Amino acid sequence: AMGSMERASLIQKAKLAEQAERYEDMAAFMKGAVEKGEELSCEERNLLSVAYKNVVGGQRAAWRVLSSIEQKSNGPEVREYREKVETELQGVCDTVLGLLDSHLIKEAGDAESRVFYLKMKGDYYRYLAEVATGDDKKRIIDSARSAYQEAMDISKKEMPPTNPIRLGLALNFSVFHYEIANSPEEAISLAKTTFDEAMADLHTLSEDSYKDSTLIMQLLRDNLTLWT
Amino acid sequence: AMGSMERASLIQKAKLAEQAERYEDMAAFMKGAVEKGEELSCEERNLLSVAYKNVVGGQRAAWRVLSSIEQKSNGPEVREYREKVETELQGVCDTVLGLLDSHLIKEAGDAESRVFYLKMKGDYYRYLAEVATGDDKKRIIDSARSAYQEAMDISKKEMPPTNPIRLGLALNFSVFHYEIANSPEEAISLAKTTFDEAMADLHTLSEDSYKDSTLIMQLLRDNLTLWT
Ligand SMILES: O=C(COc1ccccc1P(=O)(O)O)NC1CCCC1
Ligand SMILES: O=C(COc1ccccc1P(=O)(O)O)NC1CCCC1
Ligand SMILES: [Cl-]
Ligand SMILES: [Cl-]
Ligand SMILES: [Cl-]
Ligand SMILES: [Cl-]
Ligand SMILES: [Mg+2]
Ligand SMILES: [Mg+2]
Ligand SMILES: [Mg+2]
Ligand SMILES: [Mg+2]
Ligand SMILES: [Mg+2]
Ligand SMILES: [Mg+2]
């Protein structure tokens, strides 16, 4: 439905939708921009991520409310409406994963783009895993694992320990270990080593870069405090 | 799309969508319930109102952001995206007005239902008026006026001065006068007389009714403080 709109106009409208807190519109404009086929700049990658994290964040918060109500109840209505929300959440994750596979990851050659998109791949498989059951579910968990692992391998080779994309990746992979993979010790180890290696590299930063890095380090510390 | 779902299941799902903060779903379930053709109870009227006030409230807040950006700018993108949001807001107002006209108002014989639906009619024409221009716009303003006036006439004959529906009607009609009809003195007069007549009737109330009435009287007082 965005095929007839100029790429620059889709980007400009995504930014207006962000100001208006219209995140579903923002996601649809950024999906349109990706579908133009050109690589995304740093700023555009951030627009894409913000738009979908807000859309899926609303769906996840709703699904958690409904799942809690369903668990306490255990007619068909609660299950049906939790399934409705679940299906819509899955469809949003599948859309994001399709954009990453067609063809954002394969054209991303710089570390900062490749790590960003592989982190997104891990996050959206993780959202799929939160609602998955059984052993359809093992393969989804392993997909999230695999994407985070490839992102971490590149990040450790190509980026300084304070780079905010590297930090947010390690933060989200630590959440994956703690919440999805039932590996709280791996979560804690990863958040601690990430925090300590970043601390040791802060001295290399400008005031503004120091502010960006320490903000994410505080999120690692907030987790370690919840987890220990 | 809700034609195949039982009325009671639509009501139960509206309440679940409210807990999940899923207001578009809540509105669609309550539209489905109205379209079953049976009158709505007090609780169901409140579900219908909450659902649409939240949906349209999001659209109005967005439209105001975009309109402000558009005014400061004065390419086509800001106008186009403000028009998109405006059209969707109009469609939601038209849907609510259609439910009221087909056939909620005509079957509402008790004062509490009739006043509730005529207040809603005033509110949704008022939302249409906020975005309207010119003299297509005069007839919309007069439609909001007419609906509020009929509701006020019934409320004053049939309900005590502290009834919360009567109070919320007078509150919203005072907002109409101040914001839409360029009649700040009529706004202030109405909010003051409404406040003073309610104060004099508080002594007749239970503790719980007193809490419900004074909450809305505080909204009248907050307006009078903004306006004087
Ligand atoms: O409260 C949180 C905190 O989640 C995170 C904290 C640190 C890194 C990543 C997450 P994510 O699970 O991706 O939102 N997330 C809520 C957002 C919607 C449902 C869960
Ligand atoms: O800030 C308000 C206060 O509005 C009212 C105050 C008292 C009575 C009725 C209203 P309404 O204009 O119906 O939201 N409304 C914002 C909700 C979305 C855009 C405007
Ligand atoms: Cl459902
Ligand atoms: Cl490449
Ligand atoms: Cl548009
Ligand atoms: Cl009647
Ligand atoms: Mg072009
Ligand atoms: Mg399912
Ligand atoms: Mg490339
Ligand atoms: Mg039936
Ligand atoms: Mg228009
Ligand atoms: Mg009747």
mmCIF file of N, CA and C in Angstrom, chain B residues 146-208:
data_model
loop_
_atom_site.group_PDB
_atom_site.id
_atom_site.type_symbol
_atom_site.label_atom_id
_atom_site.label_comp_id
_atom_site.label_asym_id
_atom_site.label_seq_id
_atom_site.Cartn_x
_atom_site.Cartn_y
_atom_site.Cartn_z
ATOM 1 N N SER B 146 -27.400 21.312 19.284
ATOM 2 C CA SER B 146 -28.763 20.764 19.347
ATOM 3 C C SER B 146 -28.813 19.516 20.206
ATOM 4 N N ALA B 147 -27.845 18.622 19.993
ATOM 5 C CA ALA B 147 -27.828 17.347 20.807
ATOM 6 C C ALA B 147 -27.573 17.646 22.319
ATOM 7 N N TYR B 148 -26.552 18.469 22.614
ATOM 8 C CA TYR B 148 -26.305 18.894 24.011
ATOM 9 C C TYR B 148 -27.514 19.578 24.634
ATOM 10 N N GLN B 149 -28.190 20.412 23.845
ATOM 11 C CA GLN B 149 -29.335 21.174 24.378
ATOM 12 C C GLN B 149 -30.468 20.257 24.736
ATOM 13 N N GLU B 150 -30.819 19.318 23.824
ATOM 14 C CA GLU B 150 -31.875 18.341 24.136
ATOM 15 C C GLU B 150 -31.494 17.506 25.370
ATOM 16 N N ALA B 151 -30.211 17.112 25.467
ATOM 17 C CA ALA B 151 -29.782 16.319 26.653
ATOM 18 C C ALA B 151 -29.958 17.189 27.917
ATOM 19 N N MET B 152 -29.570 18.462 27.842
ATOM 20 C CA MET B 152 -29.638 19.313 29.041
ATOM 21 C C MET B 152 -31.115 19.481 29.424
ATOM 22 N N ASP B 153 -31.976 19.668 28.426
ATOM 23 C CA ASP B 153 -33.406 19.895 28.773
ATOM 24 C C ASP B 153 -33.993 18.699 29.538
ATOM 25 N N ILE B 154 -33.698 17.485 29.064
ATOM 26 C CA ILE B 154 -34.163 16.273 29.745
ATOM 27 C C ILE B 154 -33.503 16.130 31.120
ATOM 28 N N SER B 155 -32.177 16.342 31.179
ATOM 29 C CA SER B 155 -31.431 16.190 32.441
ATOM 30 C C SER B 155 -32.016 17.131 33.521
ATOM 31 N N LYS B 156 -32.337 18.361 33.141
ATOM 32 C CA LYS B 156 -32.815 19.294 34.152
ATOM 33 C C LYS B 156 -34.225 18.925 34.640
ATOM 34 N N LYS B 157 -35.029 18.307 33.785
ATOM 35 C CA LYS B 157 -36.357 17.878 34.185
ATOM 36 C C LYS B 157 -36.402 16.566 34.951
ATOM 37 N N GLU B 158 -35.467 15.647 34.665
ATOM 38 C CA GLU B 158 -35.578 14.251 35.082
ATOM 39 C C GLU B 158 -34.517 13.770 36.065
ATOM 40 N N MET B 159 -33.450 14.539 36.275
ATOM 41 C CA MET B 159 -32.345 14.073 37.101
ATOM 42 C C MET B 159 -31.991 15.100 38.135
ATOM 43 N N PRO B 160 -31.489 14.640 39.294
ATOM 44 C CA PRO B 160 -31.017 15.577 40.320
ATOM 45 C C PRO B 160 -29.732 16.253 39.822
ATOM 46 N N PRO B 161 -29.443 17.439 40.393
ATOM 47 C CA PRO B 161 -28.318 18.246 39.968
ATOM 48 C C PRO B 161 -27.023 17.591 40.235
ATOM 49 N N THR B 162 -26.973 16.568 41.100
ATOM 50 C CA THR B 162 -25.706 15.855 41.299
ATOM 51 C C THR B 162 -25.513 14.580 40.449
ATOM 52 N N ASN B 163 -26.502 14.229 39.647
ATOM 53 C CA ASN B 163 -26.357 12.994 38.860
ATOM 54 C C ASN B 163 -25.092 13.057 37.984
ATOM 55 N N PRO B 164 -24.186 12.058 38.051
ATOM 56 C CA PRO B 164 -22.915 12.185 37.286
ATOM 57 C C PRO B 164 -23.048 12.300 35.776
ATOM 58 N N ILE B 165 -24.117 11.724 35.217
ATOM 59 C CA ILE B 165 -24.321 11.911 33.759
ATOM 60 C C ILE B 165 -24.726 13.353 33.487
ATOM 61 N N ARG B 166 -25.638 13.905 34.276
ATOM 62 C CA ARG B 166 -25.986 15.337 34.144
ATOM 63 C C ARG B 166 -24.773 16.248 34.291
ATOM 64 N N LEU B 167 -23.948 15.972 35.305
ATOM 65 C CA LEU B 167 -22.710 16.754 35.530
ATOM 66 C C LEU B 167 -21.727 16.649 34.372
ATOM 67 N N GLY B 168 -21.519 15.436 33.858
ATOM 68 C CA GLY B 168 -20.529 15.274 32.759
ATOM 69 C C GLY B 168 -21.100 15.923 31.498
ATOM 70 N N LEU B 169 -22.418 15.886 31.331
ATOM 71 C CA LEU B 169 -23.002 16.576 30.181
ATOM 72 C C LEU B 169 -22.756 18.076 30.276
ATOM 73 N N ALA B 170 -22.992 18.625 31.459
ATOM 74 C CA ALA B 170 -22.824 20.079 31.584
ATOM 75 C C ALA B 170 -21.354 20.470 31.431
ATOM 76 N N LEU B 171 -20.477 19.668 32.004
ATOM 77 C CA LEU B 171 -19.040 19.857 31.794
ATOM 78 C C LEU B 171 -18.692 19.911 30.289
ATOM 79 N N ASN B 172 -19.179 18.924 29.533
ATOM 80 C CA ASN B 172 -18.783 18.847 28.086
ATOM 81 C C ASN B 172 -19.476 19.916 27.279
ATOM 82 N N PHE B 173 -20.696 20.286 27.671
ATOM 83 C CA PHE B 173 -21.359 21.390 26.938
ATOM 84 C C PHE B 173 -20.624 22.704 27.229
ATOM 85 N N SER B 174 -20.107 22.879 28.462
ATOM 86 C CA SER B 174 -19.343 24.103 28.784
ATOM 87 C C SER B 174 -18.063 24.144 27.951
ATOM 88 N N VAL B 175 -17.433 22.981 27.755
ATOM 89 C CA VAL B 175 -16.228 22.893 26.861
ATOM 90 C C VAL B 175 -16.579 23.232 25.413
ATOM 91 N N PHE B 176 -17.727 22.741 24.948
ATOM 92 C CA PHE B 176 -18.207 23.077 23.627
ATOM 93 C C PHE B 176 -18.303 24.634 23.563
ATOM 94 N N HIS B 177 -18.978 25.249 24.559
ATOM 95 C CA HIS B 177 -19.161 26.701 24.412
ATOM 96 C C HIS B 177 -17.806 27.416 24.327
ATOM 97 N N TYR B 178 -16.854 26.979 25.172
ATOM 98 C CA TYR B 178 -15.574 27.695 25.339
ATOM 99 C C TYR B 178 -14.661 27.469 24.102
ATOM 100 N N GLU B 179 -14.598 26.220 23.672
ATOM 101 C CA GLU B 179 -13.639 25.816 22.607
ATOM 102 C C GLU B 179 -14.193 25.862 21.182
ATOM 103 N N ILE B 180 -15.478 25.634 21.000
ATOM 104 C CA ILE B 180 -16.002 25.479 19.675
ATOM 105 C C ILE B 180 -16.855 26.688 19.310
ATOM 106 N N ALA B 181 -17.731 27.130 20.227
ATOM 107 C CA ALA B 181 -18.749 28.143 19.870
ATOM 108 C C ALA B 181 -18.249 29.564 20.156
ATOM 109 N N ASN B 182 -17.009 29.718 20.610
ATOM 110 C CA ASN B 182 -16.418 31.039 20.897
ATOM 111 C C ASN B 182 -17.327 31.801 21.877
ATOM 112 N N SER B 183 -17.848 31.090 22.888
ATOM 113 C CA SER B 183 -18.776 31.694 23.878
ATOM 114 C C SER B 183 -18.254 31.449 25.294
ATOM 115 N N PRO B 184 -17.090 31.996 25.626
ATOM 116 C CA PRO B 184 -16.457 31.707 26.920
ATOM 117 C C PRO B 184 -17.381 32.159 28.038
ATOM 118 N N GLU B 185 -18.174 33.208 27.840
ATOM 119 C CA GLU B 185 -19.035 33.617 28.984
ATOM 120 C C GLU B 185 -20.137 32.568 29.256
ATOM 121 N N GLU B 186 -20.759 32.048 28.201
ATOM 122 C CA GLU B 186 -21.766 30.968 28.347
ATOM 123 C C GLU B 186 -21.084 29.753 29.006
ATOM 124 N N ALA B 187 -19.840 29.467 28.612
ATOM 125 C CA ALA B 187 -19.095 28.321 29.247
ATOM 126 C C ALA B 187 -18.950 28.479 30.729
ATOM 127 N N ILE B 188 -18.495 29.663 31.102
ATOM 128 C CA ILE B 188 -18.248 29.963 32.522
ATOM 129 C C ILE B 188 -19.567 29.964 33.307
ATOM 130 N N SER B 189 -20.609 30.579 32.751
ATOM 131 C CA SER B 189 -21.925 30.611 33.416
ATOM 132 C C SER B 189 -22.450 29.210 33.628
ATOM 133 N N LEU B 190 -22.359 28.398 32.571
ATOM 134 C CA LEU B 190 -22.890 27.069 32.719
ATOM 135 C C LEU B 190 -22.074 26.263 33.750
ATOM 136 N N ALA B 191 -20.745 26.341 33.699
ATOM 137 C CA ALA B 191 -19.970 25.527 34.653
ATOM 138 C C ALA B 191 -20.226 26.002 36.114
ATOM 139 N N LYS B 192 -20.382 27.331 36.289
ATOM 140 C CA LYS B 192 -20.628 27.881 37.640
ATOM 141 C C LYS B 192 -21.992 27.483 38.216
ATOM 142 N N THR B 193 -23.063 27.667 37.452
ATOM 143 C CA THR B 193 -24.400 27.294 37.893
ATOM 144 C C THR B 193 -24.487 25.757 38.148
ATOM 145 N N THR B 194 -23.867 24.984 37.254
ATOM 146 C CA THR B 194 -23.854 23.511 37.431
ATOM 147 C C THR B 194 -23.152 23.150 38.723
ATOM 148 N N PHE B 195 -21.996 23.776 38.947
ATOM 149 C CA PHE B 195 -21.217 23.489 40.180
ATOM 150 C C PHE B 195 -22.063 23.862 41.454
ATOM 151 N N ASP B 196 -22.684 25.036 41.442
ATOM 152 C CA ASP B 196 -23.357 25.567 42.630
ATOM 153 C C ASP B 196 -24.641 24.748 42.901
ATOM 154 N N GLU B 197 -25.364 24.382 41.869
ATOM 155 C CA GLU B 197 -26.568 23.569 42.064
ATOM 156 C C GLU B 197 -26.213 22.168 42.546
ATOM 157 N N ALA B 198 -25.078 21.635 42.093
ATOM 158 C CA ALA B 198 -24.665 20.327 42.613
ATOM 159 C C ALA B 198 -24.251 20.440 44.092
ATOM 160 N N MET B 199 -23.407 21.429 44.426
ATOM 161 C CA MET B 199 -23.023 21.629 45.818
ATOM 162 C C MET B 199 -24.238 21.580 46.768
ATOM 163 N N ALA B 200 -25.314 22.284 46.403
ATOM 164 C CA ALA B 200 -26.520 22.375 47.246
ATOM 165 C C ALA B 200 -27.304 21.073 47.385
ATOM 166 N N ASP B 201 -27.031 20.075 46.524
ATOM 167 C CA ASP B 201 -27.747 18.795 46.525
ATOM 168 C C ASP B 201 -26.857 17.657 47.144
ATOM 169 N N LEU B 202 -25.592 17.961 47.464
ATOM 170 C CA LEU B 202 -24.684 16.923 47.970
ATOM 171 C C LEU B 202 -25.211 16.281 49.249
ATOM 172 N N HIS B 203 -25.929 17.060 50.051
ATOM 173 C CA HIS B 203 -26.338 16.590 51.385
ATOM 174 C C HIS B 203 -27.279 15.380 51.259
ATOM 175 N N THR B 204 -27.882 15.178 50.060
ATOM 176 C CA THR B 204 -28.806 14.076 49.848
ATOM 177 C C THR B 204 -28.134 12.749 49.522
ATOM 178 N N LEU B 205 -26.823 12.755 49.334
ATOM 179 C CA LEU B 205 -26.095 11.626 48.795
ATOM 180 C C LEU B 205 -25.484 10.722 49.878
ATOM 181 N N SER B 206 -25.430 9.422 49.567
ATOM 182 C CA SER B 206 -24.515 8.466 50.241
ATOM 183 C C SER B 206 -23.054 8.820 50.049
ATOM 184 N N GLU B 207 -22.170 8.212 50.849
ATOM 185 C CA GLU B 207 -20.749 8.453 50.740
ATOM 186 C C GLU B 207 -20.249 8.154 49.324
ATOM 187 N N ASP B 208 -20.718 7.025 48.781
ATOM 188 C CA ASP B 208 -20.219 6.618 47.440
ATOM 189 C C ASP B 208 -20.711 7.560 46.304
#
